[PDB]
Ligand binder design. Structure first.
Ligand SMILES: O=C(O)C(=O)CC(=O)c1cccc(Br)c1
Ligand SMILES: [Mg+2]
Ligand SMILES: [Mg+2]
Ligand SMILES: [Mg+2]
Length: 712
């Protein structure tokens, strides 16, 4: 066979070799001890892993049955709440406490700023993300719709000076708003110098300093004619590049070439919802990238990781700043198994357990010199998604503890970023944080998964509101506030991130800049962006909003009740016309097909897919979880018929085919000959029966089916 025997396990050879030849050397872990550990941890924790999965199903069955026996229109909230408490769904809230997590880096405990999420299987993208710690504001403004492409300001094949000037003026205002001069505007600056350790800005008829000289962080080049000036605001750096001989500098009144923003402070290297990995070959591609990132030798010319940045202090001494985003890794959650390892019965091993062992092993390299150090404070940062309730958090705690022992790492080295993205976590959040009180480095509202769970949990209650309506329903607004309240009450300020979710409209940057400011205004010290460009633009918000002061002001407040959290997003009687229903169906089918076709045929786990209004959306598994669950819910309650679904899928399919074009295999007109098309259909028609509406069981099965056919 193509497998290696270790105790009860049979490990795919490709994975075995990868760990031995690439991951283990340099960690000082004895290979025999490692592998024995893998067998032992898998043997010991699998039963509990399974019990937790069975408990989800049992809770969901009871809730389904609660709704079916009811019939009374307005849900009786006190009865419902009492029921959830009876079945162990809603648990008692623990007494107040403060987290004790230690050895965490400044980028997490203290700095407020953007957090970038990127598929770890794409080496190019992962490299750009790691390097996105610094980014060009001019490139972000000029390249996106933040500067409207009005008459005369259009993007052309070459530099448009009218447009460039708008970019320059936008940035000058940003400087005025962020690091104000004692008098006058950056708009009128003619030059910058450093004198007696102070920044001096030349204006036309006078010179001025910063209103707050402490915002002067340093410079490069000669004090008397620097090549750049470095400022800091709300803990984030801004660098003005000075080069009158450059394309842009020549047109600028002070010779400014660009303004660089400290952008993606941290990055989450994702093994979960943004990637398609269904076997040992896929997992190894991902692990190898994660390894190269931690060793600092990942290279895709040849794209490489950036070095730290050198500056001159105001007084004239030297210092450096991190040139790379501080990396988390997102492991998969408790649900899935993967045949990369099977036992003697042929049973697949739980994937989350494997990720903990393998990504944790690999992360050791990031704690040491690259022939440079991810975590200088000695932590490994793992995001754990899709947990349901505090027992599941406790299980993750014990899993990490056992892995630490296998890896010979100190206890509590492996830190947890907690996704608050399932209903049973939301309503037990304080208890969940408590279960990880010494490991937690963030909580984050994964609002898309959370929306999927909301629909699945109350699937039997009645038909839900439209997808677009969900983002503004009472339950979700209360969930957002409740998350911030819980983190602040647990002492997260100055210790751990309070984070919010992803902006998915990748081309609507003007809208993001206008709207996403709500997140740090709500006291979030970080929030998710899909790209380095969006990281730079989102950074703007942290310069405008003093998140630390916002969090301080929110202290003690309790702004969401349990009743609000439990407000099921049921649609009102006769809420939609035939045309609105048709739109929702087509919108969901197009998005499902666009994403699924690339998942199943090409193993791409995150894709831009134009919705029904032709808005580009970054789709991942969570957005698919919503679309499929919504249609499943509408089909369950007779809003639409199975023919509506079929016709819509059949309608949208040729359009999606058109949207694609070398490793692409058309779904139409032979729909039922396309594994990808059938996958999409199955996600909808079996939606109600998937545990918690999770999409992986079907996606993994169908992707594997596709690969097997392709191999013959
Ligand atoms: O909202 C949540 O459940 C997330 O966890 C979001 C998520 O991973 C995502 C969504 C769209 C694009 C990308 Br990249 C990631
Ligand atoms: Mg049932
Ligand atoms: Mg999620
Ligand atoms: Mg301020």
């Amino acid at each position: 066979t193509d497998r290696v025997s270790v105790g009860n396990l049979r490990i795919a050879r490709v994975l075995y070799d990868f760990v031995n030849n690439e991951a283990l050397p340099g960690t000082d872990i004895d290979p025999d001890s490692f592998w024995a550990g893998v067998d032992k941890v898998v043997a010991d924790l699998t039963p509990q892993n399974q019990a937790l999965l069975n408990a989800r199903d049992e809770l969901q069955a009871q809730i389904d049955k609660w709704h079916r026996r009811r019939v009374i229109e307005p849900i009786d909230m006190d009865a419902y709440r009492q029921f959830l408490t009876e079945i162990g769904y809603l648990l008692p809230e623990p007494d107040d406490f403060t987290i004790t997590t230690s050895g965490v880096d400044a980028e997490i405990t203290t700095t407020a700023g953007p957090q970038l999420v990127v598929p770890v299987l794409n080496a190019r993208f992962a490299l750009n993300a790691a390097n996105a710690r610094w980014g060009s504001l001019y490139d972000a403004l000029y390249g996106t719709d933040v500067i409207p492409e009005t008459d005369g300001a259009e993007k052309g094949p070459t530099y448009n000076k009218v447009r460039g000037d708008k970019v320059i003026a936008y940035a000058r205002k940003f400087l005025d708003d962020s690091v104000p001069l004692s008098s006058g505007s950056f708009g009128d600056a003619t030059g910058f110098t450093v004198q007696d350790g102070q920044l001096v800005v030349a204006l036309p008829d006078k010179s001025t300093g910063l209103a707050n000289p402490g915002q002067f962080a340093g410079y490069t080049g000669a004090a008397e004619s620097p090549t750049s000036v470095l400022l800091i605001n709300h803990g984030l750096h801004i660098e003005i590049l000075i080069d009158p001989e450059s394309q842009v500098g020549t047109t600028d009144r002070a010779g400014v070439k660009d303004v660089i923003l400290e952008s993606a402070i941290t990055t989450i290297m994702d093994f979960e919802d943004s990637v398609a990995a269904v076997d040992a070959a896929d997992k190894v591609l991902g692990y190898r990238n994660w390894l190269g990132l931690n060793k600092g030798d990942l290279a895709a010319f040849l794209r490489v990781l950036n070095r730290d940045r050198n500056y001159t202090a105001p007084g004239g001494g030297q210092f450096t700043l991190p040139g790379r985003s501080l990396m988390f890794v997102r492991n998969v959650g408790h649900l899935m198994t993967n045949d990369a390892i099977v036992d003697t019965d042929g049973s697949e091993v739980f994937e989350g357990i494997m990720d903990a062992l393998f990504t944790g092993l690999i992360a050791i390299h990031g704690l040491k010199a690259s022939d440079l150090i991810n975590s200088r404070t000695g932590s490994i940062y793992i995001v754990k998604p899709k947990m349901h309730g505090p027992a599941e958090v406790a299980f993750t705690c014990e899993l990490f503890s056992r892995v630490e022992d296998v890896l010979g790492l100190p206890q509590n080295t492996m830190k947890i970023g907690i996704m608050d993205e399932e209903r049973r976590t939301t309503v037990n959040l304080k208890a969940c944080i408590k279960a990880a009180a010494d490991r937690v480095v963030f909580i984050n509202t994964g609002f898309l998964d959370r929306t999927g769970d909301e629909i699945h949990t109350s699937m039997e209650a009645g038909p839900m509101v439209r997808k677009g309506t969900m983002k503004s329903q009472p339950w979700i607004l209360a969930y957002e506030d409740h998350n911030v309240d819980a983190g602040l009450a647990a002492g997260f300020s100055g210790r751990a991130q309070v984070g919010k979710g992803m902006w998915t409209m990748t081309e609507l940057m003007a809208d993001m800049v206008e709207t996403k400011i709500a997140q740090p205004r709500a006291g979030a010290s970080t929030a998710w962006v899909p790209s380095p460009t969006a990281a730079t633009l989102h950074a703007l918000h942290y310069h405008q909003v003093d998140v630390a002061a916002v969090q301080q002001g929110l202290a003690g407040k309790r702004r969401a009740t349990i009743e609000q959290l439990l407000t099921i997003p049921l649609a009102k009687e006769l809420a939609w016309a035939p045309d609105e229903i048709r739109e929702e169906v087509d919108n969901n089918c197009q998005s499902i097909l666009g994403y699924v076709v690339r998942w199943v045929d090409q193993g791409v786990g995150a894709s831009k897919v134009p919705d029904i209004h032709d808005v580009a959306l970054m789709e991942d598994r969570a957005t698919l979880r919503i679309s499929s669950q919504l249609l499943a819910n509408w089909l369950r309650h007779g809003v639409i018929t199975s023919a509506d679904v079929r016709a819509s899928l059949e309608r949208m399919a040729p359009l999606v085919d058109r949207q694609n074009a070398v490793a692409y295999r058309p779904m139409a007109p032979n729909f039922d000959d396309s594994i990808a098309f059938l996958a999409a259909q199955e996600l909808i028609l079996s939606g109600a029966q998937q545990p918690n509406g999770y999409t992986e069981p079907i996606l993994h099965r169908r992707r594997r089916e596709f690969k097997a056919r392709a191999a013959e």
